[PDB]
Amino acid sequence: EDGYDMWLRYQPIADQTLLKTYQKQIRHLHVAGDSPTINAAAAELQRGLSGLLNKPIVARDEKLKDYSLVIGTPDNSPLIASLNLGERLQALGAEGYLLEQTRINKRHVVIVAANSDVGVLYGSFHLLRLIQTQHALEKLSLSSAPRLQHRVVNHWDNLNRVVERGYAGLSLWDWGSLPNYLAPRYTDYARINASLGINGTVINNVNADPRVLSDQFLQKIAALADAFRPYGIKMYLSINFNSPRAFGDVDTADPLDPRVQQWWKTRAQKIYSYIPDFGGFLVKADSEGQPGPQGYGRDHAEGANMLAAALKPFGGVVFWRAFVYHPDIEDRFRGAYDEFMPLDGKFADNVILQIKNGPIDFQPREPFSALFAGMSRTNMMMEFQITQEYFGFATHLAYQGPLFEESLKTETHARGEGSTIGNILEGKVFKTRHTGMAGVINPGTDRNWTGHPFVQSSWYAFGRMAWDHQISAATAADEWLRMTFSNQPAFIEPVKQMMLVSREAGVNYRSPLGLTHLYSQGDHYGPAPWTDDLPRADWTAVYYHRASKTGIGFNRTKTGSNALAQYPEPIAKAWGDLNSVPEDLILWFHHLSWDHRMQSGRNLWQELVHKYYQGVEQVRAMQRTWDQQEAYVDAARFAQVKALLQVQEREAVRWRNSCVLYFQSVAGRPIPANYEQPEHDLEYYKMLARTTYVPEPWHPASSSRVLK
Amino acid sequence: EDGYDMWLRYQPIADQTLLKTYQKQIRHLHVAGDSPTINAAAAELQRGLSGLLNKPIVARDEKLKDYSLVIGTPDNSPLIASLNLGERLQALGAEGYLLEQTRINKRHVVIVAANSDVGVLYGSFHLLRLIQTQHALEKLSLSSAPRLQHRVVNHWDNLNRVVERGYAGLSLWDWGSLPNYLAPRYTDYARINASLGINGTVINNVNADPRVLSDQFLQKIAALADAFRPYGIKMYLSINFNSPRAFGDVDTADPLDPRVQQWWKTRAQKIYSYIPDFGGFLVKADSEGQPGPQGYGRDHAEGANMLAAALKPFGGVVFWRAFVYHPDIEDRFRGAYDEFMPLDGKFADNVILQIKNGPIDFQPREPFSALFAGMSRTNMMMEFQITQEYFGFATHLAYQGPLFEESLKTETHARGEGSTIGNILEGKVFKTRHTGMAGVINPGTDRNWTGHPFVQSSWYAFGRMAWDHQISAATAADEWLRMTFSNQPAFIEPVKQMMLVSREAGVNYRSPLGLTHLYSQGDHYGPAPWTDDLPRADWTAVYYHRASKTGIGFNRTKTGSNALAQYPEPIAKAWGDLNSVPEDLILWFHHLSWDHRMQSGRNLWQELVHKYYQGVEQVRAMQRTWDQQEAYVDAARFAQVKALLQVQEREAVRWRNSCVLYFQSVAGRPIPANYEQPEHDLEYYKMLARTTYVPEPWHPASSSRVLK
Ligand SMILES: O[C@@H]1[C@@H](O)[C@H](O[C@@H]2CO[C@@H](O)[C@H](O)[C@H]2O)OC[C@H]1O
Ligand SMILES: O[C@@H]1[C@@H](O)[C@H](O[C@@H]2CO[C@@H](O)[C@H](O)[C@H]2O)OC[C@H]1O
Ligand SMILES: [Co+2]
Ligand SMILES: [Co+2]
Ligand SMILES: [Co+2]
Ligand SMILES: [Co+2]
């Protein structure tokens, strides 16, 4: 096992009693349809059922035999049509499906029914997953339909093939051999994402390269689009707003100038001639030096709508990112809400505002982005991070399921109780036209796609939740572990719990209690809570925690930046009262004295030390847990994960010592004697921050020759 | 087939008659020894014999059975010792072996015998190779010893894991998980190289990063050395001559300063404490802005000897590169010879001068480096390039076997007939102590290690030629094709001839007739024969061709730069007379009028055009040849090579058109009417040079957003 198949491991069911049962149930595979998508479904079932059931199952269009798996839509399979499923099937829409043990013409059969061909494909993947996870097919009757419209992944890939915040190798897209070489991996990539119901992908960096819109690259991209099409995945591209000028065709990119409007209309026509079902554009504009409307004195609705008007005739959409924040504002936290609230209602119907789960930047824990509960007349979608920019690259084990679950189940009170983030995204709260979530996966050419094996679990969790936002981190992990490693109960429970605690461990050894943004800038690998004196203050560490001799935290109540007033009243009330604010968010909103007593009985200095030390202990416990699993995992992946956990323990100790000693130097309070005193002093950890290798090809820190 | 196994494909022998014969001859594997090296040999024979013979062959130490493969040395295998091989074994030295079908106490055996364990390992790989190439074991009696001491590969890997002139992915060395994670791939890398007899590797960029000498990185590198050691491969490191300054320990790097001498001796001690059999140092100094002794007003002997004094007590050596040339000389061709000739005999016995095959920079054809025939009191070694910096990156098929053979069989007349480069390298011509050959392979994390499947053939040939410098390109291709693809004679012949013509095709469409250095600067992917006006002229294209309305070529005779006088008399004569100079080198030494008549009857302009058009035709012929092999090759690799050849044809045409149109614009002569006239003009090809994607992560050109 080298991880190439990820969770699509079609190995014979290990439980022999169960294997026999499946073997009696699925003896033939009946597929009448022959469209590309149906063919892809048949091909997956054929390879999947043959592997899992350890016998040759070939997809065939023949007279129905007893004990068959029959797939199709009423339109492409007369057998499925004969069941007259009616309303039951129809309610499942354009992507849903029904899996049911039933009878046709007296024959025993298990049907993968749907209204569309992509519905059959999704249904087929679920059929396989049931087997992969050793669920019973007897009396099977289940239907499912996705709860969000655009379920997409994002790749921050540069055209040179280096991935920004990419810890799993070079970009998968081999531009030098495209379009001529349709590599097998492009199809496997499609199969991975289709297996989760992911129906779209942005293959290029948001720090966007204009070349993607030239003929040279559109031919390459079209070949990728072709490979992805039979698997229901639409192609999207990140665009550079200054494209008209980069191509030398117009002396401005002002969205109100007719020549600019025409440039993009003509370019959309060119794109659509290459990729007739192109999904549309992802846009990072007027943020971190990236070009945008405000550079021409226009607003984000004006810029987005101009792009949207160009794509509208072709059915394309603009995913316009809300990750915007000007250096001059008093509180970065407030930024996005204050930028976009005045524009609510001004965006065209095929513009969707793509918002990170939190107001800052993918930190281990952030409160929900206020825009989610505030924008009532604009299409929204979520942006989550899978690649571990802030969770330890490819060396740290960190299942992100819980982060996503936490976010999606957060009650916002936008329109009273029941206004969870998930319900907002689905369109149940504010009535909206387009819904979705995007996941920044940043996989690469490493054999196992994600570098660290467990980053696969995050990918998985993300994909499952995009399909159904109420799926728990626990459910997703159970499924993933069974598909990826083993169906042994003794293995699943400990390793699932290990996965479930990994995120919190990553909070604890880095920045607990509402602390945030304590990373080495700008690589983000290691600790650097002392960071100051950067061109922009809101990229430093001290800006956020505002530690002094008397206290720590950032005042976001009515007496401070009043960011709490950007939230619905019940959240503002709960978070602004020291009696009710969750301790896991406290320092985001309150500047508190070191003597403040926490729920545990410890003072805030004590509780900070306790959490940092807890994070390291949690990693050490993960080590012990993983070591007890050697009998259930293959030798190669076992050794790799064991080794990576050793690296993570070493770094978590470095994180703990660096942060505790730094905050000690400011607070001037001792570390309690029941905690192991750090091996060295604060200057040594500063030196370690300057010299400890940063393991990412992209960030310049990896080339740093600093040795002192 | 995804190329991960390279030429060590242990699939069952297809010829059933042959298979039975091998199955009757090798029924058991007898191994008495148990050292790490013998264990690795035994492991290789076990996996190899089992796969090739399609039956379980397990290494055992037991009472000898009839029809056994018996391996060992007289010291570790009583059975081998009982044969009293004597003088037969003595002639094999420290790395040689004997392969022989014989008898031990009545029992039919085949022995792999040597004086050392590594000799047994090398012999074990040859035994496998015999079987892999379907050679008969009956009456087998052969011996072999390497002809060069230091057979190494070079990795231009940066510590961020980007490879300089790297077309095959990221660096193999995963510094973020080292030393903790001993990846299986590290062992497979060792197996690949040991299979060829390669006993050394320089893992880091010659543009050297001083971090490799820090404890942080030495701990990581030692884990690599540990993995490489049982395979007989020693560890070497490129060094930065300014390291004492970079570490902040001394205020100069002057080699005559006692503090600097002491810094390197103390650092050597540190290195050997981690790696007790460390091979030594590779050094790029006073070249292309890299630091060196001349930066302190010292010479290369003074610099090299100071490093050599530090390594001497530990047995280490210094590979000092002669790739040096300063911008204000009249003729870069003369550079290295004028730099090093005055230092002949001034280098310590553990310094070896590492010299490129030619005096410029790995161009598709270069005459031999004059230093090989001139230095008589200095250890020398060859530097060859495998990675296709100048042969089309990972998209062009360019077997380098013929280049290496051409070089190694070149008569220099240094000391009579038989003064071939190969014979000089062996130490027979000048009587030197330390000999070798280095190969710049630059593989990466791509699944097939080399990107383009055929780059594996060039690595293969290099290693075989490092073992025996008289091995032909034809022989190495025959072996490689059989090991990599098929033993079918109808496949071997045409694909072997295709491989053999590929180098020459790459000369023809780029720079035939002694033209050189016509590449886009400084990425090197595409044509740019117009290149001028760079910070230094010797990095441009016009500097070399000197094309004008009246002629082309560079005068290196007595009436020009007189670089020919740097060669032995007979060579200068032959190359300096228009009657005897090879046409494949003519423009290196002579500036000729466009009306000069060539051997073919064509004038020089006509011949120029003919060659450029010939190169494209040769690529088209390679396409047709490869299409005829579909029945013999697995579908995946077949499709991949088919597609790459399409990219190569497109590029070859771009090269042909760009060059023919450029030289036409200078010469003012028509392209003869029988040739397909390019439809676009020269300005268009200049535009394509600015905008055609450069497929390499490392060079900045791949990030170029130029669109016009
Ligand atoms: O969210 C912000 C990040 O975008 C920022 O990342 C920066 C990207 O550009 C790099 O050149 C910088 O080094 C790096 O800091 O980091 C700060 C964070 O607030
Ligand atoms: O041999 C010379 C090369 O070394 C040179 O390659 C240069 C390497 O440094 C890069 O930064 C430059 O861009 C590149 O030109 O090119 C010319 C060749 O003569
Ligand atoms: Co894995
Ligand atoms: Co980059
Ligand atoms: Co645990
Ligand atoms: Co206290």
Ligand SMILES: [Co+2]
């Ligand atoms: Co290959």
Ligand SMILES: [Co+2]
């Ligand atoms: Co680099």
Ligand SMILES: [Co+2]
């Ligand atoms: Co041919």
Ligand SMILES: [Co+2]
């Ligand atoms: Co003419």
